[PDB]
Model the fold of this input.
Amino acid sequence: IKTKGDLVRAALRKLGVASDATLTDVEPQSMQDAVDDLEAMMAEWYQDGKGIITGYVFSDDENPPAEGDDHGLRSSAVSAVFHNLACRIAPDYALEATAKIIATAKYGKELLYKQTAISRAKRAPYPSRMPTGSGNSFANLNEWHYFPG
Amino acid sequence: EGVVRLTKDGQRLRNMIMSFNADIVARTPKKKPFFWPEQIAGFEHMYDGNDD
Done:
């Protein structure tokens, strides 16, 4: 919602574990383990910028991730993040995420990568053996063949 | 009788068939893919006709 602890608490709430709708209370090491899992999942998604970009901020090497650090995700990315976190940490508590949670996580990941896929759908420039036709007046500048890609 | 009296029916039928075929050419919707609105949701500037 606003910090990594919130992403963990909402994910646990979705799974039905450690939520105030069932009078269940939280364990601090559950927070620590789920934050570590969230960090690992976000890093695996990111792949140092070669994968999905969500605006998530990763804790530096010197300071281990904590509950109170802001996630930095966009307002349209929180839902997918905590749904996928719940799916990932479901086996932790000997549980399997319901079909609705899995479907929501898949839909959220699709929506996260939609804009990146649109941005990365860029055509390559013309080949290096393509001639610039006589209709281009820049041909007079000795630019008879295209620049290489 | 002259020469254009017995060709009236055939010529009228020819004109009617040509008019019907021109109507078919003009008013028939062209060939475009059938898409669900959810299939292309967010990807709707890729099917506009651009080659980008």
User: Anything to note?
Assistant: Chain A has one domain: 1-149.
